[PDB]
Amino acid sequence: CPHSDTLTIDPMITDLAGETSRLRAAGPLTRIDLLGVPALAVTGHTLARQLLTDTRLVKDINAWSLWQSGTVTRQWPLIGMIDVDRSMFTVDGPEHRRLRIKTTQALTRRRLDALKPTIERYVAELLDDLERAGADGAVVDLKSVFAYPLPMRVISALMGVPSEDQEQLLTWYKAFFSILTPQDERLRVIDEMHGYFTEMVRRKTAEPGDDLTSALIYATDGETPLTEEEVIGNLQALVAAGHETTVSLILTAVRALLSHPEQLRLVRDGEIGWETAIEETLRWDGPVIHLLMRFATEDIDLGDAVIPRGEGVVMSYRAIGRDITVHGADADDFDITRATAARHISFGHGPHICPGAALARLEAAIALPALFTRFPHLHPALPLDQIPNLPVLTQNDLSHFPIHLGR
């Protein structure tokens, strides 16, 4: 269809592959349209690396000229992705580290050793649900039975979300992410999520436990305490991210491996590490499509192009993972043996780099082999290429994943 010099991101995710190719080819910096709102998108690996460390690009929505003019408001269906409370997510500079430190420390690989048994238990529980559900050769939704609930259980255990509240959170998130949710109802869901997590912080304040939320509340020894807004802001970021991204990584890793059986075999037979298959999945078909937004505090000259003060900059991570300069001409193929499998930046780069990356990697490294060892003849009951995305513009969110447990 006709040549346009603004690339409209289709909210129905009708053509993710085409849109992702279009972006790579239009880049590495190009003009996009997000439901009527213009922004720049970084689609190049090298330029993203550089801009993710540029101190003239900030998260603070008040640096967005469109926000300042009141051209964008809370009616924008994408607004909840950025206009959120003070947290590691919305801060830049020297104040940023303070908002990250207790979380990074809690999520180092060895601190995570103690969470391992827990993850194991939940993976086993849900494989048991799979077995029950796939009985008598029935078709089973791998997402709803397995991949969807696992990461919620895990992040909930970490942060101290009661078992009985986890369902309602999922109901809220589904509403939150879907473009289809009416905007007034989305804003109501956002207020309701905020109210929940506020009360959770109060509950942990009265009665702290061995959880990260309690550690955010009562920090080291001397330190300058986080404010209520900050504790709540981090909590929300950790849960939302911790759940939504991980569900995708599991589903795409499976889809990838089932659609490339020789590669599944490589890892089953211990010739390639499940971890490496995980990295390649992040590079190729990762959890984040577009990362909303950064803003220029002043004009940013890049050579033959300029990001004007006030402009919105999006990191188009999926397009970045398909960078042919970095990954070679076969960048669009899934190949776990490629030499650049782990050179991606799908968790980001610079100060805002994903703090939960070790946890994400561990959830997958446990879930995937457990899944395939338990159900070695697991296979799709629907062509993998026919698994549609949910209308979720920023996230690689698969709708459902019909399988059979197999022989």
Site size toward ligand HEM (CB under 6 A) is 26
The partner residues of 312 in beta bridges, in order of sequence, read: 295
**Residues composing the chain:** 407
Q: Which does residue 67 bind out of Mg ion, ligand ASD, ligand HEM, none, counting CB within 5 to 8 angstroms by kind?
A: none
Please give the backbone phi and psi of residue 53, each rounded to the nearest 5 degrees, phi first.
-115, 0
Task: Give the residue with the Cβ less far from Mg ion, 5 or 207.
Answer: 5
240, 247, 315, 367: which one binds ligand ASD (CB under 6 A): 240
- Between CA 366 and CA 84 the distance in angstroms is 32
123, 127, 237, 313: which one binds ligand ASD (CB under 6 A): 237
237, 264, 277, 371: which one binds ligand HEM (CB under 6 A): 237
- Which span sits near Mg ion by CB under 5 A: 2-10, 202-210, 240-248, 294-302? 2-10
Q: Site mask, ligand ASD, residues 280-309, x = CB under 6 A?
A: --------x---------------------
- Which span sits near ligand HEM by CB under 6 A: 129-137, 263-271, 295-303, 342-350? 342-350
Q: Site mask, ligand HEM, residues 155-174, x = CB under 6 A?
A: x-------------------
Paired tokens of 99? 């908002």
- Between CA 54 and CA 350 the distance in angstroms is 9
Q: Which does residue 84 bind out of ligand HEM, Mg ion, ligand ASD, none, counting CB within 5 to 8 angstroms by kind?
A: ligand ASD
- Between CA 170 and CA 165 the distance in angstroms is 9
Task: Give the residue with the Cβ less far from ligand HEM, 134 or 394.
Answer: 394
Would you say 16 and 289 are in contact if contact means Cβ atoms under 8 Å apart?
Answer: yes
Rg (CA), the chain: 21
Secondary element (H or E) of residue 31: strand 29-34
Would you say 244 and 395 are in contact if contact means Cβ atoms under 8 Å apart?
Answer: yes
Work out the burial of residue 125: count CB atoms within 10 Å of its CB; fewer than 13 is exposed, 13-18 middle, 19 or more buried: middle
- Which span sits near ligand HEM by CB under 6 A: 131-139, 243-251, 302-310, 398-406? 243-251
Output the CA–CA distances (angstroms, integers) from residue 146 to 44, 133, 239, 403, in the order listed. Answer: 34, 11, 18, 12
- Between CA 368 and CA 365 the distance in angstroms is 6
- Between CA 308 and CA 311 the distance in angstroms is 6
294 annotated among ligand-binding-site residues: yes
Secondary element (H or E) of residue 216: helix 212-217
Would you say 134 and 405 are in contact if contact means Cβ atoms under 8 Å apart?
Answer: yes
Site size toward Mg ion (CB under 5 A) is 1
Secondary element (H or E) of residue 39: strand 37-42
Task: Give the residue with the Cβ less far from ligand ASD, 27 or 242.
Answer: 242
322 makes contact with ligand HEM (CB under 6 A):
no
Q: Site mask, Mg ion, residues 4-43, x = CB under 5 A?
A: -x--------------------------------------
- Which span sits near ligand ASD by CB under 6 A: 81-89, 102-110, 304-312, 338-346? 81-89
Task: Give the residue with the Cβ less far from ligand ASD, 266 or 354.
Answer: 354
Secondary element (H or E) of residue 33: strand 29-34
Name residue, tokens 């062509």.
383
Helices (H) and strands (E) in the chain, counts: 16, 11
Q: Which does residue 244 bind out of ligand HEM, Mg ion, ligand ASD, none, counting CB within 5 to 8 angstroms by kind?
A: ligand ASD
Q: Which residues bind ligand ASD (CB under 6 A)?
A: 80-81, 84, 89, 236-237, 240-241, 244-245, 288, 395
As annotated, the binding site for heme b includes 96, 100, 294, 317, 352, 354
Q: Which residues bind ligand HEM (CB under 6 A)?
A: 88-89, 100, 155, 237-238, 241-242, 245-246, 249, 286-288, 291, 315, 317, 346-348, 352, 354-356, 359-360
